[PDB]
Design a protein around this ligand. Structure first.
Ligand SMILES: NC(=O)c1ccc[n+]([C@@H]2O[C@H](COP(=O)([O-])OP(=O)(O)OC[C@H]3O[C@@H](n4cnc5c(N)ncnc54)[C@H](OP(=O)(O)O)[C@@H]3O)[C@@H](O)[C@H]2O)c1
Ligand SMILES: NC(=O)c1ccc[n+]([C@@H]2O[C@H](COP(=O)([O-])OP(=O)(O)OC[C@H]3O[C@@H](n4cnc5c(N)ncnc54)[C@H](OP(=O)(O)O)[C@@H]3O)[C@@H](O)[C@H]2O)c1
Ligand SMILES: Nc1nc2c(c(=O)[nH]1)N1C(=O)N(c3ccc(C(=O)N[C@@H](CCC(=O)O)C(=O)O)cc3)C[C@H]1CN2
Lengths: 287, 295
């Protein structure tokens, strides 16, 4: 009766080992060349501090040079833009991202900041240029946001093809839900996107051969709602009376065929995909 | 109940009259100000010439200043790009579009040309930057491609709110299907997108309280498939020969209209439905661009 456990910790480790071998070979082929990632943080949130360290540690194990720039809570939009512009022009820097959410005492427009990022270095894939390419089916030449990229990879580890399947995405955020739809749609699923104004959410979820939940409501998607045999991808990271997903795992694992645990599921794959995007940016720059 | 007929010909006429009144008032409020559209053509295709005249005539009736720049077939990519760049920088020009397809004797990359358009003037809404803004929820100020804009307007003329309805889009094209999803999603429908690899397309369509079909397969979506009470938006323009018609051809939609009209509550006929909304929507987008510039 248990669903097969998609082990994001093992799978991300396989990916990071592969990338390390890729990165080793670029240094042997072009000695002294170093792929380089930069992460720009605003404020000092404890969760952002933790997530940034995980990105930095994965990078340094692969042989990527990872720079961390922490700006204080007093920072303004103009200052943030000056750094974006400097990283744009610093040719030693192949990929960079702005960690979200921004922790400033001033108003800052997240979209204007992200959209100043040079699209060739937009490893998080959150620029409108990259979003627009993904949303319209032009996957040849954009970055894809790291969380949905990781989710797509996890779905593929099942061996079950996506084409013609009815997939359901619960959530439509810029970072996960909306690009998750687009990735599923352009891999030929029939995709239903749900959100907070969706009526009869249970009956929608029950149609999902593929289910990707990204809502930030702890365990809200019950196991009864899960289609028997579904692939369940749980993007949730919620702290409770302990970390739980957006899916009620214990009840969902009896119904699903493949499921992502929390932690050890989507989380470590998000970082592996960031590193993959960083190495692609470094490879394209060598031309 | 036979379905209420959404008359695109009347509704587009109401919109064009209203925009004219809007445009008159902006000139009286801010004297000297002239909303301005530019259309850039390459070559001399007969269909493009016809479509451009219709756009220009609608614009001049509204009081929009409409510039037509027709470049010869000998034109190169570099020349086309130089014009795009000049219209980008010409501050008197609020909206512009490149009419497609381009008719040149030289190779020209249509995607690179379109994507050089400044996103703030992209009234046809096809740039990647504008598509991305629409796709991720920035409907306050992005441009919307004219066909799905027209579809959204027609849905609203019913008075039936969109929020929490299950909507179905059959088709995912850059021109119609994909931007149609985004409009529906950001008006709080739960949206299911279908395409050529969708299995059991009939049973998907049957879940649609709102249905927007844009496939180019004549009458493929049968009336049986339609959910009782649905709003049916038919984007199809498919020609079938017919000697009983003045010009020897009939137009049918992507929906089997006669069988679908018994099941739906509101439906768009073909012709006279989505089609005549097209140009009015370009003009509406042009005035939005002019209004934002006035600030
Ligand atoms: N593992 C990773 O790498 C990773 C990355 C990013 C985020 N996350 C985690 O994933 C979760 C969500 O992330 P996010 O960035 O996508 O969040 P977000 O921006 O807060 O958006 C959450 C989405 O869930 C929808 N939602 C909320 N309540 C709902 C309900 N009752 N029924 C249906 N849908 C509902 C919202 O709809 P509306 O748009 O209508 O508000 C929204 O689209 C959080 O736990 C977050 O920590 C994980
Ligand atoms: N009145 C106007 O001004 C106006 C403007 C633009 C378009 N239109 C009309 O709208 C229609 C569609 O145009 P378009 O530009 O979207 O066409 P398109 O670019 O050819 O795309 C057609 C879409 O329909 C899908 N499709 C095709 N056969 C299907 C099937 N058997 N089952 C399900 N989906 C199927 C295709 O699937 P795949 O994604 O799998 O290829 C694709 O997504 C045409 O009749 C066109 O003339 C009207
Ligand atoms: N622009 C931007 N902002 C952002 C992200 C982003 O991509 N781009 N995000 C991440 O990196 N996040 C994340 C989440 C989890 C982890 C992570 O490694 N835990 C694992 C631990 C895995 C294990 O080793 O067992 C987990 O949740 O299970 C590592 C980064 C969250 C989100 C927050 N904000």
């Amino acid at each position: 009766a248990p669903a097969e456990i998609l082990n994001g910790k093992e799978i991300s480790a396989q990916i990071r080992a592969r990338l390390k071998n890729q990165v080793t070979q670029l240094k042997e082929q072009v000695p002294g060349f170093t792929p380089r990632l930069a992460i720009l943080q605003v404020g000092n949130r404890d969760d952002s501090n933790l997530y940034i360290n995980v990105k930095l540690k994965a990078a340094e194990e692969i042989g990527i040079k990872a720079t961390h720039i922490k700006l204080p809570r007093t920072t303004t939009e103009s200052e943030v833009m000056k750094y974006i512009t400097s990283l744009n022009e610093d040719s030693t820097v192949h990929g960079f991202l702005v960690q979200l959410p921004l922790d400033s005492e001033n108003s800052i427009n997240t979209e204007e900041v992200i959209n100043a990022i040079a699209p060739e270095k937009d490893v998080d894939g959150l620029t409108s240029i990259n979003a627009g390419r993904l949303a319209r089916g032009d996957l040849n030449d954009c970055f894809i946001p790291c969380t949905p990229k990781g989710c797509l990879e996890l779905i593929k580890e099942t061996g079950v093809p996506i084409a013609g399947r009815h997939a359901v995405v619960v959530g439509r955020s810029k970072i996960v839900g909306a690009p998750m739809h687009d990735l599923l749609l352009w891999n030929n699923a029939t995709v239903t996107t749900c959100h907070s104004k969706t009526a009869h959410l249970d009956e929608e979820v029950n149609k999902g051969d593929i289910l990707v939940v990204a809502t930030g409501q702890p365990e809200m998607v019950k196991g009864e709602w899960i289609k028997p045999g579904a692939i369940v991808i749980d993007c949730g990271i919620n702290y409770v009376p302990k970390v739980v997903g957006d899916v009620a795992y214990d009840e969902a694992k009896e119904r699903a065929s493949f499921i992502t645990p929390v932690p050890g599921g989507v989380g470590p794959m998000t970082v592996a995909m960031l590193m993959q995007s960083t190495v692609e940016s470094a490879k394209r720059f060598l031309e």
